[PDB]
Amino acid sequence: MSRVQLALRVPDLEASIGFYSKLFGTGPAKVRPGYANFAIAEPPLKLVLIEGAGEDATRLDHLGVEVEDSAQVGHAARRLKESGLATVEENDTACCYAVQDKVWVTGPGGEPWEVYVV
* Cβ–Cβ < 8 Å for 66, 73: no
Contacts of 62 (CB under 8 A, 6+ apart): 7, 111, 112, 113, 114
**x/- string (CB under 5 A) for Cl ion, residues 19-58?**
----------------------------------------
Least separation in angstroms between residue 108's CB and Ni ion is: 20
Most distant CA pair in the chain: distance in Å? 42
Q: Is 5 annotated as a binding residue?
A: yes
Where do runs of H (alpha helix) occur along 25-102?
A: 70-83
Interacting partner of 63 out of Ni ion, Cl ion, none (Cβ under 5 to 8 A depending on kind): none
Q: Is 75 annotated as a binding residue?
A: no
Nearer to Cl ion, 52 or 112 (CB): 112
If binding means CB under 5 A, how many residues of this protein chain bind Cl ion?
1
